Write a protein that binds this ligand. Structure first.
Ligand SMILES: *[B]([O])([O])[C]([C][C]([C])[C])[N]C(=O)[C]([C]C1=[C][C]=[C][C]=[C]1)[N]C(=O)C1=[C]N=[C][C]=N1
Ligand SMILES: *[B]([O])([O])[C]([C][C]([C])[C])[N]C(=O)[C]([C]C1=[C][C]=[C][C]=[C]1)[N]C(=O)C1=[C]N=[C][C]=N1
Ligand SMILES: *[B]([O])([O])[C]([C][C]([C])[C])[N]C(=O)[C]([C]C1=[C][C]=[C][C]=[C]1)[N]C(=O)C1=[C]N=[C][C]=N1
Ligand SMILES: *[B]([O])([O])[C]([C][C]([C])[C])[N]C(=O)[C]([C]C1=[C][C]=[C][C]=[C]1)[N]C(=O)C1=[C]N=[C][C]=N1
Ligand SMILES: [Cl-]
Ligand SMILES: [Cl-]
Ligand SMILES: [Mg+2]
Ligand SMILES: [Mg+2]
Ligand SMILES: [Mg+2]
Ligand SMILES: [Mg+2]
Lengths: 204, 222, 233, 211, 226, 196, 195, 196, 195
């Protein structure tokens, strides 16, 4: 019944030293039934990354919508959109449906191409921006993720250390959530290289 | 309409060592968005080297503990001052809880102590009386925040040995009391940050063959 | 199951170095009607305990009678009724707490919030709360209803933790309580200007003050406030 | 929850998962859903944990008293009926219990399904819980009376795995039991995470999953 | 949420805590509840977080265009009027509870605003779940003819009352001072009485602890030449 | 809320308490419920604060525009504009308003507009939750053609009792005097009116 | 309606759909074909609320046929599935949403690959090797998880499909009156007349 | 219903209207709400007529039996018996009762028992739906140690206003005077009290 | 449970009862015997709420078996049916009524006549040549009204019963997994093992 917990799923993002990381599970379900183990929730528009949890139809719809808008932005501005600007676009777009909202929990992650500054942000389903320094969490295991991130996280981690921290935060949170798991992906992001890693986890 | 139940918040944590056990819990008592007390004890020494905490609805928690303490007293009277073992106490508590199957004690309950072989023991209960022995258990408001952390840092879940790449697990080495207390404090400090009902103070009860010892630590008061 | 009819609002209290203070206004409200203006909601039990009650007044009067009968019963076959075997604050509280929890367990509660304030035999301060649910807790400051939201913050500025109790005098504590009662009169719509205050000290005993009034109120600034935004006249 | 049990040539297999949930939160990774009533009687658990534990442990009291009075072990049929009659006293009061009473007696191996409604069914094969449909799929296509003890243990183990994978409220680990005329025999706790990858490689199944 | 506003001799000051919640969970520990409508008109917001920001940006935008159209500095009464009419129109469904303050050619002003569209005038105001704890402090310590330094102290003391005693409020204290004939000073994190203590242990893992299946480079660059 | 408007020899006087409540919490203890819609046409507001403010603002706009075209409007005209809003939007409003004004031709006039949006011209009017407790007192003590000082005492005593018994009413007693001489604001504090 | 299954094998997609239509307590028909050919190499099966199903299917069919004529070109199964998803995602926030779940089986002539898409009434799209709607998956996915290989022949796909139907016929309380099976491959769409 | 009991120098006087209603229909216009439970202990009844009659009958039985064993009961004792019934059966009752009586030792006493079953000893008391409209009037006009004639006028004027404004109140004003001299019944008709 | 049929022919009574037992969305058993022998020449089939059915049936069985031992005499089908009706009429005004519908098929050895009684959970008794409970009659009574004669043989009764089951299997949405058929005559009770 609750749209935000029909399909299930989680997203988490973290800042490091001159880098950011964003990760998600791969599950898509119909309540108790597991339907897909390949439903990736992280998308990218140039160098800006967007993770979306919640109702799967709205996740798909919003990806297609932000692809639409970022492609026009680029044609007119003659440059790729930056994380700070994209974050405002996400907020604007969500609030325009204030009284008929998309049932989602978006998470933005990326590095400003000019300043080199790492950036992450989280939103509620209607556009409120949470611009955190440390980490952002979203999904059906958000309580679990808060507990993991708040204890495991420390600032200024190197890319290969940050990978381990965010991975362990996601994995153990997902293993205490019935509606999350069935695989996981982690993006490690630096100013001009991005690595994507699929994690091995329990498939129940 | 009269609602006979309420939520006084709070969070509790039990960890079983090799020859010891700990039962910790925050000292904050609340209703809705108000604080009732910054120091209201929640973990109790019930006698016979057993510690207990009933988290949830305070009135039902105080009543259950009071009854179990009473059950220990009468166990001595009836069976020639025999020591109530932790397994026997656990089974006794199941029957205390199920006596109200149709008007339950609204509490998540944990007891800790030592088994008859001297090893550390933790038992966990649901409000209607289902129980089971465990190595690690967080209960109450911030239970969902803490348990995943304990799966990772106590049972080494999803942790493998470098170089093998997922082929060989991290071996399950035992934890010392000093190591356990670090995990307890970091658990409650993290829970305090993200959960509004957790804070003010942390009281830990440590159980060994020598007896029951207490430790208290301040937490954030916001 | 019932609904409260004639009600009493906040009861506030705090510990200080040599004892406890408790206070409550003299009003018995009938919904939004401020019906009864001479209601005493602090009820002394012996010379070492004061029970402050908020909520349903008919249930309060019932509790008042239980306590009166408790004193009578304690004196029976008790040569030390006025000495070693006198009623303690802890005895009185636990009795009430037993009654409140039993009544909630029969789905027929006493619709009240109670604070038992007193001093024990050994000179220790006693301050504990109990309500219709049988919920109990203790703290250096305690308050019911609106007092919990407005009085506690003010009183916790004086005694924020246990170590502040010996540093707090009876003059400072009474000043804080009286200020809190004024604030409740400003902001609680079911409060009255008239109130009662009781001090239980381990040296000077029980001092019961009646017919107190909220004074030194600030209202003058109201003359300068005009309209709700744009209006100048 | 997924539990199953089936009779065969060499007795009865009993397999269960170990997951416990409180809403979408996984409260327990390792819940024991079997009860050892006596050396020749087992009981599975599905539904409310409190109800399952209390009433099946109370059944064990009543089955033990039977032995003392009669100097003889209770039948599986009689044990299952005592339990169903307990459920019939709290008729409509809201108990949630689904259990299979598995054992060996003078008639040979015995298997009875019992639930909170008071239903009591004899049969060769049963499966209860939120993941029973997934387990039945594997069982129905691979079951034979002529099964070996080794293959039968695997079938029950593999059937739970199927359910643990698909059903969100099933998982954790697999507990196996084998009931003979000399009593039940515990065949260990098997983590699903490790078991899944093992079965995938050896069997070739779960091709759609990547590993 | 605890937000306050206090008038003084030559201006007005507003303050707020920095906690955001969903149920018993804290979403943001360092949230910014102080909003700029115009350079010398700021408002503090309680209630639904997206609504306080959105309604504040919209009116701020229209105030800026109005200022350009009229060749005048914006007035607090204008922002007040535009906010209340907007909120009234949405019959409380836009959950924005605001304390609006500022200085303009008319003088210094302090107003409150509720979600249904009712406005109130005062020398001291408080809104949010911790408004009762804050108002208790204000009613105890406020006086006429406060100085700038006394008013900041009163305002932050009122926020602290909310932080400590209200579970819906916490973390830090933000302040904004608007004095006549001066630039408005926005004091982000004026107080920081809730820094987390050092953890007992480091949870940095050995490299290679997490099991991996696949690795791949992600192409973020555009289509290349040649 | 306790509000009233009383006509007398030299004109009309409006009176009100200053309490605004959210349940039992007093959201504002120094509220101004006496509102100006024209130079010498004022109103007393009861019910929803948002609704009554929105209405009064619209009325003030209508009468400002009326004045620009047709000159000073009558008190009856002002009451009609209030009525039109309260009647046509009765399903979505909760507003009990008393309209009072002074002409030189018609002198002091009072119109009360309860929930339904009906209009009633009276010598005096009382409204708000606290008015229930003073129907008896006001009926027994009101006289026509009272002096300014007598009328001030009548309102002071009446609202004093309404405040005493009604929890939704309290604070200071605000008053506004409307005569040929001009517009005078009065205020009376608790220490003054409680001892009556 | 009730039951719709789909399985993508090596060189084809196989769709199986129940034949029953029930009104009140009576089964009106036991030979109903719950499918529409969208294009020569794309087939869509459907299940949901009465009436809405056929009207949605025929509306999609008309749009794809219109596209085919306009461009003299067959849309890829992926393009068709995306169009269908958008129509359902549009529909879910309408005054009265269309309560229809679909499976789209197509053979991409460009890539020479069979493709199976599962889309529910909310507009939730997923590409799968095998899929189902409603309760059908609860009974059948355990068999498919076990037996399915991506290099299976069409004949092996049909045998695994028979096993799925047999399991349904054993453990489902409802009688769905068997299934109509259709195969989609490089040569187009054909119906298996004996199943 | 409009009922009141007022103590004065020589004793106590009870007063009541005579209207009983079933919605807006007046089922009885000459009701006697002033009820005798003992020679010089009477009560005023408001709320359910069935409940208040059943209670008063039980009380009269208790006090008759009390008298046979222990002699004349006090007014406080009578109020306690009322309370015990109203409090212990609060879930199933709707009864607002005022108890009034005259002793030689204690003189005139008045106890009011509202819905909850609480007891309140007062110099005077008012109750019933119509009492709301005269809280202001009664508070302003009541004095202690009034004469019989002054007290009769006070009750007459008070209930006159309560009747005027309350639809549930009306008919005749009944009164019962309790003094050392004995028990006197009074009645005042509409033509008399309406012109006040 | 679901389906129970009864038909009284010349010299016997034939009862047919479904074999299915469903819990949730899964069919747990397809060989369930929904009947109890009350006495050597009296058989009772039953259908209603889960659990209540068997417990009521076994309670009736015990009472009749007790009577048989006490009197060393078999009660007539009419007497048994009246006892059963009274227990149900008693039950319907209880705190928690037993939701059970029954058919009682018996051969009266005194009168040398077969007898079929239909009793619903309210205690509504009727003697009939053929009967059913629930929706079963909606599909089958038209066939029985047409084909039934009172001089039919047992073999003819079985053929007409097969026709009724075939009609149910065609037009009922639910799969009841066939029926167990039992015959009650002068020689006692026997089960038709092939149907
Ligand atoms: B299983 O899901 O039936 C399981 C079996 C039980 C013996 C542990 N039950 C539970 O997980 C239930 C929830 C539930 C989920 C799905 C179907 C039915 C029931 N939970 C509990 O019994 C429970 C008890 N205490 C704490 C947490 N959960
Ligand atoms: B405070 O509690 O009023 C605060 C002020 C806000 C401007 C930061 N409000 C919140 O924290 C609200 C509480 C709320 C919860 C649920 C519905 C409505 C309001 N929180 C949020 O708006 C919120 C919740 N989750 C993420 C982001 N924002
Ligand atoms: B008075 O009580 O009618 C008063 C008059 C208003 C114009 C200031 N109204 C209120 O206080 C109302 C509530 C109410 C109380 C009693 C009767 C009718 C209505 N309150 C509000 O409108 C209000 C309260 N808190 C915030 C915003 N608005
Ligand atoms: B009075 O209105 O309270 C009156 C007093 C009674 C003792 C004669 N009560 C009634 O008239 C009640 C209805 C009622 C009206 C207003 C407040 C409370 C109750 N009426 C009856 O009890 C009644 C009416 N018709 C027939 C029988 N009883
Ligand atoms: Cl206002
Ligand atoms: Cl009467
Ligand atoms: Mg706080
Ligand atoms: Mg699973
Ligand atoms: Mg009248
Ligand atoms: Mg019948």
């Amino acid at each position: 019944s609750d749209p935000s917990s029909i399909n299930g799923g989680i997203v988490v993002a973290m800042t490091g030293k001159d880098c950011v990381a964003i990760a998600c599970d791969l599950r898509l379900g119909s309540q108790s039934l597991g339907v897909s183990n390949k439903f990736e929730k992280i998308f990218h528009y140039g160098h800006v990354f967007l993770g979306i949890t919640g109702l799967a139809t709205d996740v798909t719809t919003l990806n297609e919508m932000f692809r639409y808008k970022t492609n026009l932005y680029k044609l007119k501005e003659e440059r790729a959109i930056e994380p700070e600007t994209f974050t405002q676009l996400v907020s604007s777009s969500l609030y325009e449906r204030r009284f008929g909202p998309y049932f989602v929990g978006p998470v933005v992650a990326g590095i400003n191409s000019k300043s080199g500054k790492p950036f992450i942000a989280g939103f509620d389903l209607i556009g409120c921006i949470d611009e955190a320094k440390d980490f952002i969490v979203s999904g059906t295991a958000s309580d679990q993720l808060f507990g993991m991130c708040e204890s495991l996280y420390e600032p200024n981690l190197e890319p290969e250390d940050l990978f381990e921290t965010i991975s362990q935060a996601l994995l153990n949170a997902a293993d205490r959530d019935a509606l999350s798991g069935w695989g996981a992906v982690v993006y490690i992001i630096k100013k001009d290289e991005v690595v994507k890693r699929y994690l091995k986890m329990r498939q129940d | 309409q009269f609602n006979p139940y309420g939520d006084n918040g709070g969070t509790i944590l039990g960890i079983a060592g090799e020859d010891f056990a700990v039962l910790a819990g925050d000292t904050r008592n609340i209703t809705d968005y108000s604080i009732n007390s910054r120091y209201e004890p929640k973990v109790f020494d019930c006698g016979d080297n057993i510690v207990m905490s009933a988290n949830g609805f305070a009135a039902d928690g105080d009543a259950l503990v009071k009854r179990f303490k009473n059950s220990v007293k009468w166990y001595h009277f009836d069976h020639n001052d025999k020591k109530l073992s932790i397994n026997s106490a656990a089974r006794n508590i199941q029957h205390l809880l199920y006596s109200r199957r149709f008007f339950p004690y609204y509490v998540y309950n944990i007891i800790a102590g030592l088994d008859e072989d001297g090893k550390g023991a933790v038992y966990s209960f649901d409000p209607v009386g289902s129980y089971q022995r465990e190595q690690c258990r967080a209960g109450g408001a911030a239970a969902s925040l803490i348990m995943p952390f304990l799966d990772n840092q106590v049972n080494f879940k999803n942790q493998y040995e470098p170089g093998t790449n997922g082929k060989v697990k991290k071996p399950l080495k035992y934890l010392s009391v000093e190591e356990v207390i670090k995990l307890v404090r970091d658990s409650f400090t993290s829970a305090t940050e993200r959960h509004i009902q957790v804070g003010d103070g942390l009281e830990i009860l440590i159980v060994t063959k020598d007896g029951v010892r207490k430790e208290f630590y301040e937490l954030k008061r916001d | 199951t019932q609904q409260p009819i004639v009600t009493g609002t906040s009861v506030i209290s705090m510990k200080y170095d040599n004892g406890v203070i408790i206070a409550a206004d003299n009003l018995g409200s009938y919904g939004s009607l401020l019906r009864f203006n001479g209601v005493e909601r602090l009820i002394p039990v012996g010379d070492n305990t004061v029970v402050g009650i908020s909520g349903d007044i008919s249930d309060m009067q019932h509790i008042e009678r239980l306590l009166k009968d408790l004193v009578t019963e304690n004196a029976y076959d008790n040569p030390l009724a006025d000495a070693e075997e006198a009623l303690e604050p802890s005895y009185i509280f636990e009795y009430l707490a037993t009654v409140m929890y039993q009544r909630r367990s029969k789905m027929n509660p006493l619709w009240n919030a109670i604070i038992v304030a007193g001093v024990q035999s050994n000179g220790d301060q006693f301050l504990r709360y109990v309500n219709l649910l049988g919920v109990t807790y203790s703290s250096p400051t305690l308050a019911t209803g609106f007092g919990a939201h407005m009085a506690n913050p003010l009183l916790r500025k004086v005694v924020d933790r246990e170590s502040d109790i010996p540093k707090t005098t009876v003059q400072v504590a009474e000043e804080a309580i009286v200020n809190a009662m004024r604030v409740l009169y400003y902001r609680d719509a079911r409060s009255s200007r008239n109130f009662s205050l009781a001090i239980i000290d381990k040296n000077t005993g029980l001092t019961f003050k009646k017919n107190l009034q909220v004074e030194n109120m600030k209202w003058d600034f109201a003359k300068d406030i005009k309209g709700y935004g744009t209006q100048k006249i | 929850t997924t539990t199953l049990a089936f009779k065969f040539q060499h007795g009865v297999i009993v397999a269960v998962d170990s997951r416990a949930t409180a809403g979408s939160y996984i409260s327990s990774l390792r819940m024991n859903k079997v009860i050892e009533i006596n050396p020749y009687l087992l009981g599975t658990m599905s539904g409310c944990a409190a109800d399952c534990q209390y009433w099946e442990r109370l059944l064990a009291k009543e089955c033990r008293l039977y032995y003392l009075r009669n100097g003889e072990r209770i039948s599986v049929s009689a044990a299952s009926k005592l339990l169903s009659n307990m459920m019939l006293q709290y008729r409509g009061m809201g108990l949630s219990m689904g259990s299979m009473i598995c054992g060996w007696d003078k008639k040979g191996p015995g298997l009875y399904y019992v639930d909170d409604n008071g239903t009591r069914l004899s049969g060769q094969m049963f499966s209860t819980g939120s993941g029973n449909t997934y387990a039945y799929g594997v069982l129905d296509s691979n079951y034979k009376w002529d099964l070996s003890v080794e293959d039968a243990l695997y079938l029950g183990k593999r059937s739970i795995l199927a359910a643990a994978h698909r059903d969100a409220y099933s998982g954790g680990s697999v507990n196996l039991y084998h009931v003979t005329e000399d009593g039940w025999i515990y065949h260990g706790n098997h983590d699903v995470g490790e078991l899944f990858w093992k079965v995938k490689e050896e069997e070739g199944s779960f091709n759609n999953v990547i590993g | 949420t605890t937000i306050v506003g206090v008038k003084f001799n030559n201006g007005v000051v507003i303050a707020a805590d920095t906690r955001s919640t969903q149920g018993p969970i804290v979403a943001d520990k360092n949230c910014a509840k102080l909003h700029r409508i115009s350079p010398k008109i700021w408002c503090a917001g309680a209630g639904t977080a997206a609504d306080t920001e959105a309604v504040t940006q919209l009116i701020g935008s229209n105030i800026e265009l109005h200022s350009l159209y009229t060749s005048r500095e914006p007035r607090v009464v204008s922002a007040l009027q535009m906010l209340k009419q907007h909120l009234f129109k949405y019959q409380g469904h836009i959950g924005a509870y605001l304390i609006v303050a500022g200085v303009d050619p008319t003088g210094s002003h302090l107003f409150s605003i509720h979600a249904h569209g009712s406005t109130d005038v005062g020398y001291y105001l408080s809104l949010g779940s911790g408004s009762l704890a804050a108002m208790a402090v204000l009613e105890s310590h406020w006086k006429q003819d406060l100085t700038k330094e006394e008013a900041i102290k009163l305002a932050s003391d009122a926020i602290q009352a909310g932080i400590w005693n209200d579970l819906g409020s916490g973390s830090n204290v933000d302040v904004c001072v608007m004095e006549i004939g001066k630039d408005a000073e926005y004091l982000r994190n004026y107080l920081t009485p809730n820094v987390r203590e050092e953890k007992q242990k480091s949870y940095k893992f050995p490299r290679g602890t997490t099991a991996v299946l696949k690795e791949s480079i992600v192409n973020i660059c555009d289509i290349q030449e040649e | 809320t306790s509000i009233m408007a009383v006509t007398f020899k030299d004109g009309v006087i409006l009176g009100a308490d200053s309490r605004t409540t959210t349940g039992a919490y007093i959201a504002n203890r120094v509220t101004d419920k006496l509102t100006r819609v024209h130079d010498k046409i004022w109103c007393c507001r009861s019910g929803s604060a948002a609704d009554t403010q929105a209405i009064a603002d619209i009325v003030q706009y209508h009468l400002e525009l009326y004045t620009s075209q047709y000159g000073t409007p009558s008190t009856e005209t002002a009451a009609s504009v209030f009525k039109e809003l309260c009647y046509e939007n009765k399903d979505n409003l909760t507003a009990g308003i008393i309209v009072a004004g002074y002409d030189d031709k018609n002198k002091g006039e009072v119109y009360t507009i309860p929930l339904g949006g009906s209009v009633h011209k009276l010598p005096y009017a009382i409204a708000g939750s606290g008015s229930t407790f003073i129907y008896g007192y006001c009926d027994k003590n009101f006289r026509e053609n009272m002096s300014k000082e007598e009328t001030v005492d009548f309102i002071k005593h009446s609202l004093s009792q309404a405040i005493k018994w009604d929890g939704s009413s309290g604070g200071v007693i605000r008053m506004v005097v409307l005569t040929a001489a001009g517009v005078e604001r009065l205020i009376f504090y608790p220490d003054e009116y409680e001892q009556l | 309606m009730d039951i719709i299954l789909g399985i993508r094998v090596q060189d084809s997609v196989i769709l199986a759909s129940s034949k029953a239509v029930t009104r009140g307590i009576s089964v009106l028909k036991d030979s109903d074909d719950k499918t529409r050919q969208l294009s020569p190499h794309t087939l869509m099966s459907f299940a949901g609320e009465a009436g809405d199903t056929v009207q949605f299917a025929e509306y999609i069919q008309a749009n794809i046929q219109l596209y085919s004529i306009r461009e003299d070109y067959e849309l890829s199964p992926q393009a068709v599935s995306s169009f269908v998803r958008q129509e359902l995602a549009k529909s879910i926030r309408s005054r009265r949403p269309y309560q229809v779940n679909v499976l789209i089986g197509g053979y991409d002539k460009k890539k020479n690959k069979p493709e199976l898409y599962q889309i529910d009434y909310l507009g939730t799209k997923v590409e799968l090797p095998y899929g189902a709607h409603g309760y059908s998956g609860f009974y059948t996915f355990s068999l498919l998880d076990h037996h399915y290989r991506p290099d299976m022949t069409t004949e092996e796909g049909l045998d695994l499909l028979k096993l799925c139907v047999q399991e349904l016929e054993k453990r489902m309380p409802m009688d769905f009156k068997g299934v109509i099976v259709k195969i989609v491959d490089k040569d187009g769409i054909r119906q298996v007349d004996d199943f």
